[PDB]
């Protein structure tokens, strides 16, 4: 800054990754340091509410109500705007079972059915399955034996 003090972005923050060591500067506040990058297993995903509207890497606009779902074996890169709500393991589904679910908000499910709030539906698919950010896990439902 013209005063000779370093200029500051104030309310804005600053994420960092791997680089050569750097001096801290006056007026800075180190909220965070030294942590392995957010690793994630293939059969689990990150649930991520926006704090405020922001640009996406793909050019997509992001509403504050939007819920990101980062699935797959990887290491997610945090944004100062992105907030980490939680983590959800994918639900395994053994043969002859169905994954009961509920709609916490109006939307479309992977089945493609229109989903009014409070609606419930089966998940026919066998094997591991990841619930959607609106989808809520309940229980596996075994098929009744029929001799």
């Amino acid at each position: 800054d013209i005063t000779g003090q370093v200029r500051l972005r104030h309310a804005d923050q600053e994420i960092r990754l791997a680089q050569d060591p750097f001096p801290l500067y006056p007026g800075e506040v180190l909220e965070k340091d030294i942590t392995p990058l957010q690793v994630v297993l293939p059969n689990t995903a990150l649930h991520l509410k926006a704090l405020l509207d922001f640009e996406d890497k793909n050019g997509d606009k992001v509403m504050a109500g939007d819920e990101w779902l980062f699935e797959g074996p990887g290491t997610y890169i945090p944004q100062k705007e992105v907030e980490v709500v939680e983590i959800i393991q994918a639900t395994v589904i053994k043969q002859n079972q169905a994954l009961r679910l509920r709609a916490r908000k109006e939307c479309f499910d992977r089945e493609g059915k229109g989903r009014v709030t409070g609606e419930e539906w089966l998940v026919r698919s066998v094997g591991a399955y990841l619930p959607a950010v609106f989808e809520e896990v309940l229980d596996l439902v075994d098929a009744v034996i029929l001799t």
Partner: peptide, 22 residues
Amino acid sequence: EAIIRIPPYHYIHVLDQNSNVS
């Protein structure tokens, strides 16, 4: 004291009172 030996991977936030800035 007036003498300040800075180690190669180290830093200090000096506060100049004349310009009233760090």
